[PDB]
Amino acid sequence: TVDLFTSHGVYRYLTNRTNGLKLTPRENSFESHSFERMPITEFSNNERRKG
Amino acid sequence: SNNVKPQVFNPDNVMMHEKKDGTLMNEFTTPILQEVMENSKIMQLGKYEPMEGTEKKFTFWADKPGAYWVGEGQKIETSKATWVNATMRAFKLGVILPVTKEFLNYTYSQFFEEMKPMIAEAFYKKFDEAGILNQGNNPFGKSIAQSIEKTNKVIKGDFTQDNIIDLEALLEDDELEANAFISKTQNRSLLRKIVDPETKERIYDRNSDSLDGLPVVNLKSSNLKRGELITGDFDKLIYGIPQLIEYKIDETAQLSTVKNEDGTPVNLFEQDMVALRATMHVALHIADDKAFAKLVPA
Amino acid sequence: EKKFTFWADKPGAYWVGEGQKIETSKATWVNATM
Amino acid sequence: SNNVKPQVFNPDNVMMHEKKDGTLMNEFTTPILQEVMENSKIMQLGKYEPMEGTRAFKLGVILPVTKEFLNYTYSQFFEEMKPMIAEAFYKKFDEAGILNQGNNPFGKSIAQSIEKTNKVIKGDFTQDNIIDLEALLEDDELEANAFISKTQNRSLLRKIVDPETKERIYDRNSDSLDGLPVVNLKSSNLKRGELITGDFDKLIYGIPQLIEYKIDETAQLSTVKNEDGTPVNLFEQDMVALRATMHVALHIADDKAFAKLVPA
């Protein structure tokens, strides 16, 4: 199951490796959110992101 | 010697900035790509399979236990399970383009950049024609046309609702259901005039390129004749790609499938030449030879 | 006057055994004017 | 290789640490510049022409070196040889453009211009013959810009004095004749008693590709045979080679602009 987060909403898909990860739309294929920028945030341990 | 005339090559595969008649090719108008590059139809229809090495192993169940009716206090009897194995291996595609560095400086600065999609097209076509039609020195001992030939799962006759439904029925005769059709674009003329005489429904959507509601894929190959149509449960066709296309460009190797006018092998360094190598690894496996059927004109 | 150049020959491609020689091929183009 | 006699090459162009007589150049002291560098004369006199693409022709050379030589005998060899190659190119170009020598690829040269227009003076160097040589140009409204000479004839030029001003017409310090600069050609083809002059702005040249250098440790030198006749493989034979290439173009805008003085 794939969730794709953009600055306006979430798109949701299904995939399998067998078919080559062809993203197929899903029940309630899109879901709006009220932020104005992509909601996921990444933190890095250092400049190189190494553990 | 101080021989200043341009070098003749055999075969004439080398790109050159100067012609042997003395014409010098400045101000070259870079050609524009007319068509659209074709995708691999196998990569479109088939099932992908991760494959790390040049070989892959599959194992499936084959036999299942029985059961028995037993009276009170009666001895319960035994039963047995069983499995079977299958395997697939990869093969390597490739080609080399040699280019004279004068050509690469004063005629076509982007030439190698413009060839990479044309190489990917030629590779995908080579793969499709090998796996689908068993053409072009198919390296695999496996192919759709070869499975159909060994099963004799062929219908003879004209494109008709009768024969196309019989063709699909030939798969559930083996408890398999058809998933798509492979056809030659020349023949949608024939499909675009076969109609069910009760319902007056047309079997073919001219609009959606669906035949009896299944999706149709067109081959650009010249081997598949107009009157021929192929169908199957393509989920039984497995393919793998251990090494996606790798390009490398080399300025110092020796070529040997190309010879100088005097017959000496072409040395890229000593002769001031550059050559572009492209390769790809691809693997193909038919999981069930019975899953494919073909319609052919009588 | 107008002039055009189009790709006409695609390069080929070869199946190559393990450690065998990769063979060469060439593209070509054709000129037209209208 | 394990060969205890050094490898004989044909042609014998490969640099080697061990001489044929078995002498080994260990701790070898670096050579020194016994002569100055000879700049290109047509690149000095002629008019540069901005040129894109190629008529041009390609000059080139390859220098193979035994890596023993490159390690023990002379480590900096390829860094110090680059300008000497550039001099070789300048000399080949000058000799082709001026004298029509050395299998010049162009159909154009000053020697051919003079041979076509027959603008030649038979005679010894005298003030009157120098004036006639210059007048051969000014006849056609063109004025001499410089002189080209074999340096070995300054001994002749010092013997000419203007009988009016009663002073040397040739300034041996300025190396200028009748107020015009004289350039010296070291090539062996221009003879002792020969002198050339012209309006060199009518000689045009271009250089689509400046001298490019590539060092390689892998190629095969088809042109250099081992003693057994097999081509030299740099990697297997532990060898290194430097490739140099250049593109030069030459054009003569008016072939009557050049005249030559030659012994009778």
Under 8 Å CB-to-CB from D221, ≥6 apart: which residues? B267, B270, D62, D64, D231, D232, D234, D241
Q: What are phi and psi of D161, to 5 degrees?
A: -130, 140
Burial tier of D147 (Cβ tally within 10 Å: 0-12, 13-18, 19+): buried
Query: Residue D245 corresponds to which tokens in the numbers above?
Result: 């290439």
Nearest C-alpha in B relative to A19: B47
Burial tier of B105 (Cβ tally within 10 Å: 0-12, 13-18, 19+): middle
Question: In this structure, are strands B154-156 and B292-296 parallel, antiparallel, or unpaired?
Answer: parallel
Look at C15 and B130 and tell me if their CB atoms are within 8 Å.
Answer: yes
Rounded to the nearest angstrom, the gap between the alpha carbon of residue D141 and the centroid of all alpha carbons in its chain is 31
Measured between alpha carbons, how far is residue A21 from residues A1, B1, B90, B129, B167 in Å? 10, 62, 21, 24, 30
SS3 assignment, position C24: strand
**Measured distance CA(B111)–CA(B122) in Å, rounded:** 17
- Partnered with residue D212 across adjacent β-strands are D245
Quick check: bond before D11 cis, omega within 30? yes
Q: What are phi and psi of D95, to 5 degrees?
A: -65, -35
| CA-CA-CA-CA dihedral for B215, B219, B223, B226, to nearest 10 | 60
The CA distance from A26 to the nearest CA of chain B, in Å, is 21
* C5 chain-B contacts, CB cut-off 8 A: 29-32
**Measured distance CA(D227)–CA(D176) in Å, rounded:** 53
Which chains share 3+ C-beta pairs under 8 angstroms with C? B
**Measured distance CA(B30)–CA(C29) in Å, rounded:** 9
Give me the amino acid identity at D244.
A
- Partnered with residue D196 across adjacent β-strands are D148, D260
Nearest C-alpha in C relative to B124: C13
Query: Residue B220 corresponds to which tokens in the numbers above?
Result: 């650009």
A48 secondary structure, DSSP code: T
Contact B249, B290 (CB under 8 A): no
A18 secondary structure, DSSP code: T
Q: Which residue has the tokens 């023949």?
A: B187
Query: Residue B102 corresponds to which tokens in the numbers above?
Result: 């004068």
Return the H-helix or E-strand segment holding A28.
strand A24-32
Look at C15 and B139 and tell me if their CB atoms are within 8 Å.
Answer: yes
- Partnered with residue D167 across adjacent β-strands are D162
Pick B256's closest partner by Cβ from C10, C21, C27.
C21
Handedness of CA B290, B295, B296, B298 (dihedral sign): positive
Which of A18, A19, A21, A22 to probe the B interface (max B CBs under 10 A)?
A18
* B48 chain-A contacts, CB cut-off 8 A: 17-20
Query: Residue D18 corresponds to which tokens in the numbers above?
Result: 């061990």
SS3 assignment, position C32: strand
A31 secondary structure, DSSP code: E
- D165: Cα within 13 Å, side-chain hemisphere: 9
Residue D143's CB is within 10 A of a number of other CB atoms, namely 11
Give me the amino acid identity at B142.
K
Q: What are phi and psi of A24, to 5 degrees?
A: -105, 130
Q: Which residue has the tokens 């030449």?
A: B273
Query: Residue C14 corresponds to which tokens in the numbers above?
Result: 């070869």
Look at D220 and B270 and tell me if their CB atoms are within 8 Å.
Answer: yes
* Cβ of residue B47 closer than 8 Å to a chain A Cβ: yes
Number of Cβ pairs closer than 8 Å across B and D? 49
Under 8 Å CB-to-CB from D125, ≥6 apart: which residues? D153, D156, D157, D159, D160, D193, D195, D261
Which of B92, B125, B134, B268 to probe the C interface (max C CBs under 10 A)?
B92
Handedness of CA B118, B121, B123, B129 (dihedral sign): negative
Under 8 Å CB-to-CB from D251, ≥6 apart: which residues? D49, D108, D203, D204, D205, D206
Look at B270 and D58 and tell me if their CB atoms are within 8 Å.
Answer: no
* Cβ of residue A16 closer than 8 Å to a chain B Cβ: no
Query: Residue B290 corresponds to which tokens in the numbers above?
Result: 């019975």
**Measured distance CA(D87)–CA(B167) in Å, rounded:** 80
Could you report how far apart the first and last alpha carbons of chain A are, in Å? Answer: 28
- B20: Cα within 13 Å, side-chain hemisphere: 6
Nearest C-alpha in B relative to A20: B48
Nearest C-alpha in B relative to D233: B254
Nearest to residue D234, comparing CAs of D250, D253, D246, D216? Answer: D216
- B154: Cα within 13 Å, side-chain hemisphere: 16
Rounded to the nearest angstrom, the gap between the alpha carbon of residue B73 and the centroid of all alpha carbons in its chain is 62
- Partnered with residue D215 across adjacent β-strands are D242
Return the H-helix or E-strand segment holding A25.
strand A24-32
* Cβ of residue A20 closer than 8 Å to a chain B Cβ: yes
Chains A and D are touching, with contact defined as 3 or more CB–CB pairs separated by less than 8 Å:
no
Buried b (16+ CB within 10 A) or exposed e, D53-65: bbebbbbeebbbb
Contact B98, B12 (CB under 8 A): no
Q: What is the CA radius of gyration of chain A?
A: 15
Quick check: bond before B11 cis, omega within 30? yes
Look at D105 and B272 and tell me if their CB atoms are within 8 Å.
Answer: no
Look at C13 and B258 and tell me if their CB atoms are within 8 Å.
Answer: no
Under 8 Å CB-to-CB from B28, ≥6 apart: which residues? B107, B108
Q: Which residue has the tokens 């030459």?
A: D250
Give me the amino acid identity at B190.
L
Nearest to residue D57, comparing CAs of B18, B261, B99? Answer: B18
Contact D210, D196 (CB under 8 A): no
Chains B and C are touching, with contact defined as 3 or more CB–CB pairs separated by less than 8 Å:
yes
A46 secondary structure, DSSP code: S
Look at A19 and B48 and tell me if their CB atoms are within 8 Å.
Answer: yes
Q: Which residue has the tokens 């790509």?
A: B33
**Measured distance CA(D129)–CA(D157) in Å, rounded:** 12
Query: Residue A51 corresponds to which tokens in the numbers above?
Result: 């553990």
Look at B272 and D243 and tell me if their CB atoms are within 8 Å.
Answer: yes
Contact B234, B45 (CB under 8 A): yes
Q: Could you write out the DSSP letters of every residue in chain B?
A: ----SPPPEESS--B-SB-TTS-B--S--PPB--S-PPPPHHHHHSEE---SSSEEEEEEEEE--------TTPPPPP---EEEEEEEEEEEEEEEEEEETTHHHHT-TTHHHHHHHHHHHHHHHHHHHHHTT--SS--SS--HHHHHHHHT-EEES---HHHHHHHHHHHHTTT----EEEEEGGGHHHHTT-B-TTT--BSEETTTTEETTEEEEEE--SSS-TT-EEEE-GGGEEEEEEEEEEEEEESS-EEEEEEETTSPEEEHHHHTEEEEEEEEEEEEEES-GGGEEEEE--
Which of B42, B45, B47 to probe the A interface (max A CBs under 10 A)?
B47
Query: Residue B133 corresponds to which tokens in the numbers above?
Result: 């039609």
Look at B24 and D54 and tell me if their CB atoms are within 8 Å.
Answer: yes
Question: In this structure, are strands D9-10 and D220-226 parallel, antiparallel, or unpaired?
Answer: antiparallel
Look at C6 and B277 and tell me if their CB atoms are within 8 Å.
Answer: no
Residue C2's CB is within 10 A of a number of other CB atoms, namely 6
Reading across the β-sheet that carries D120-122, which strands appear in turn? Answer: D120-122, D258-262, D195-198, D146-149, D180-184, D176-177, D170-171
Pick D219's closest partner by Cβ from B2, B17, B267.
B267
Question: In this structure, are strands B180-184 and B214-219 parallel, antiparallel, or unpaired?
Answer: parallel
Under 8 Å CB-to-CB from D127, ≥6 apart: which residues? D160, D161, D162, D163, D169
Give me the amino acid identity at B73.
G
Nearest to residue D248, comparing CAs of D204, D208, D200? Answer: D208
**Measured distance CA(B227)–CA(B188) in Å, rounded:** 10
User: HEC string of D80-105?
Assistant: HHHHHHHHHHHHHHHHHHHHCCCCCC
Measured between alpha carbons, how far is residue A51 from residues A40, A44, A47 in Å? 20, 9, 11
**Measured distance CA(A14)–CA(D187) in Å, rounded:** 80
- D236: Cα within 13 Å, side-chain hemisphere: 7
Q: Could you write out the DSSP letters of every residue in chain D?
A: ---SSPPPEES--SB-SB-TTS-B-TTPPPP---S-----HHHHHSEE-------EEEEEEEEEEEHHIIIII-TTHHHHHHHHHHHHHHHHHHHHHHH--SS-SSS--HHHHHHHHT-EEES---HHHHHHHHHHHHTTT----EEEE-GGGHHHHTT-EETTTTEESEETTTTEETTEEEEE---TTS-TT-EEEE-GGGEEEEEEEEEEEEEESS-EEEEEEETTSPEEETTTTTEEEEEEEEEEEEEES-TTSEEEEE--
The CA distance from D134 to the nearest CA of chain B, in Å, is 36
A17 secondary structure, DSSP code: T
Measured between alpha carbons, how far is residue D188 from residues A45, B74, C7, D117 in Å? 73, 120, 53, 24
* B41 chain-A contacts, CB cut-off 8 A: none
Give me the amino acid identity at B211.
L
- B23: Cα within 13 Å, side-chain hemisphere: 7
* C27 chain-B contacts, CB cut-off 8 A: 97, 115, 118
Q: Whats the size of chain D, residue-wise?
A: 264
Buried b (16+ CB within 10 A) or exposed e, B225-252: eebbbbbbbbbbbbbbbbeebeeeeeeb
Query: Residue B126 corresponds to which tokens in the numbers above?
Result: 């080579």
The CA distance from C27 to the nearest CA of chain B, in Å, is 8
Give me the amino acid identity at D118.
N
Contact D202, D254 (CB under 8 A): yes
Buried b (16+ CB within 10 A) or exposed e, B139-163: bbebbbbbbbeebebebeeebebeb
Contact D164, D131 (CB under 8 A): no
The CA distance from B20 to the nearest CA of chain C, in Å, is 17
**Measured distance CA(D47)–CA(D49) in Å, rounded:** 6
* B30 chain-C contacts, CB cut-off 8 A: 5
**Measured distance CA(B212)–CA(B214) in Å, rounded:** 6
Pick B31's closest partner by Cβ from C15, C18, C29.
C29
Which of D63, D218, D232 to probe the B interface (max B CBs under 10 A)?
D218
Q: What is the CA radius of gyration of chain C?
A: 16
Nearest C-alpha in A relative to B239: A18
- Partnered with residue D221 across adjacent β-strands are D232
Return the H-helix or E-strand segment holding C28.
strand C28-33
Buried b (16+ CB within 10 A) or exposed e, D94-111: bbbbbbbbeebbbebbbb
Query: Residue D65 corresponds to which tokens in the numbers above?
Result: 């070196």
